[PDB]
Design a protein around this ligand. Structure first.
Ligand SMILES: CCCCCCSC[C@H](NC(=O)CC[C@H]([NH3+])C(=O)O)C(=O)NCC(=O)O
Ligand SMILES: CCCCCCSC[C@H](NC(=O)CC[C@H]([NH3+])C(=O)O)C(=O)NCC(=O)O
Lengths: 219, 220
């Protein structure tokens, strides 16, 4: 059939989670750039694909899938050769599902509460409370990492959500190494992947850099 | 033997679980975790959930944290059919997408509003917080193309959404004339014979309690 299509932007953290998932699955993704910065997500063809007007959005031969965590689950279920990235055991799957919602309701939400007002609303500060909210999220991630990976002894799509966000926010709200030895060790694991820098590492670094740059530019 | 829920009825994600349990005909044994007295910060609770949030499910020794994971787990283990959580990958992707919209958008913005009031002695709701919330309503309204959030059928994504929306509309006004789809979706849900007991009273009461805490904090 047709190559999977991702409506996407490499700077976007949930887009990078899907790109790591694809690489892990040995899937090739056709990327169509939706540039948020020149407003492409609000242009009206894109709004028909996604009424929430967010990226990523998946086009699988006419089946449209919105939302990074739904996209990654969809890809593993349909294109996985096993369920190592997304367990089929109800209990180990619950540990993954709980970690995905941690990423969306805590890690990504708090990051967005910090980045969006700068990238999109023209602000030039990061308030004391935002810093504390984010740093609290780092601490929750540290406490969750009782195992090598976020949702157990094995790497799952919940690791990809988590690192796509953490690698972006770390260079704005500092993640100090000694308060956070478990996160540090975990980053190291994921960096061992052959596709890590390419599918996430650098896009994360660059998003952090870009927010600081646009913030001096807003002050 | 008893499925146990570590819970507080005012908490939206606890009520989402309560709705799901009713929809499946399950009976939950509820154990109070009083967040207002820091029950969740105690070592006994942190052992159950290192993120120290409610709800936590205890299924005969098996510990399942996080409302959305718990609802899935429960439908997976106890559902007689798949209508509340589909097996079909595409249909299921539309529910999973609404669940992450509830956690990442509806709940996270409601908590960005409530938490500072209930725990940090704040008397205000900053302007931007109100704007985040109003924007969450508009996104939900645009999502409701069908009768329910993830299609023509009611799913666990409806329980998660209403538990929250029923709590925040008490505090940040959800204007009827601008959100007629949300109002019609609410009326569908309140038809459920277990709606009031499982959700309606708690949602209303959390709204009230936030409004009362806010006034209290503005005195002293
Ligand atoms: C260059 C910076 C990249 C932006 C950083 C935030 S990620 C992009 C943002 N995406 C989301 O909010 C997606 C959240 C959703 N939970 C998912 O995981 O897909 C968006 O499309 N926002 C557009 C909108 O919401 O209107
Ligand atoms: C008076 C009732 C008001 C409670 C409203 C917020 S709900 C309770 C709050 N729960 C959560 O954040 C859980 C959200 C999570 N994604 C889920 O759905 O399980 C909590 O335990 N918070 C504790 C913490 O983070 O320390």
């Amino acid at each position: 059939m047709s190559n999977l299509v991702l409506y996407t932007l490499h700077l976007s953290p949930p887009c990078r989670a899907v790109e790591l998932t694809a690489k892990a699955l040995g899937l090739e993704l056709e990327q169509k750039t939706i540039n948020l910065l020149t407003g492409d997500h609000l242009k009206p063809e894109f709004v028909k694909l996604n009424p929430q007007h967010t990226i990523p959005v998946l086009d699988d031969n006419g089946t449209i899938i919105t939302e990074s965590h739904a996209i990654m689950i969809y890809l593993v279920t349909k294109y996985g050769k096993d369920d190592s990235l997304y367990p089929k055991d109800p209990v180990k799957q619950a540990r993954v599902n709980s970690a995905l919602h941690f990423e969306s309701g805590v890690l990504f939400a708090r990051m967005r509460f910090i980045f969006e007002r700068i990238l999109f609303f023209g602000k030039s500060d990061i308030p004391e409370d935002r810093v504390e909210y984010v740093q609290k999220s780092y601490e929750l991630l540290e406490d969750t990492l009782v195992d090598d990976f976020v949702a157990g002894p094995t790497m799952t799509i919940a690791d990809f959500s988590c690192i796509s966000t953490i690698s972006s926010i770390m260079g704005v709200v500092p993640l100090e190494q000694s308060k956070h030895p478990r996160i540090y060790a975990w980053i190291d694991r994921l960096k061992q992947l052959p596709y890590y820098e390419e599918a996430n590492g650098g896009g994360g670094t660059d998003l952090g850099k870009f927010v600081l740059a646009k913030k001096e530019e807003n002050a």
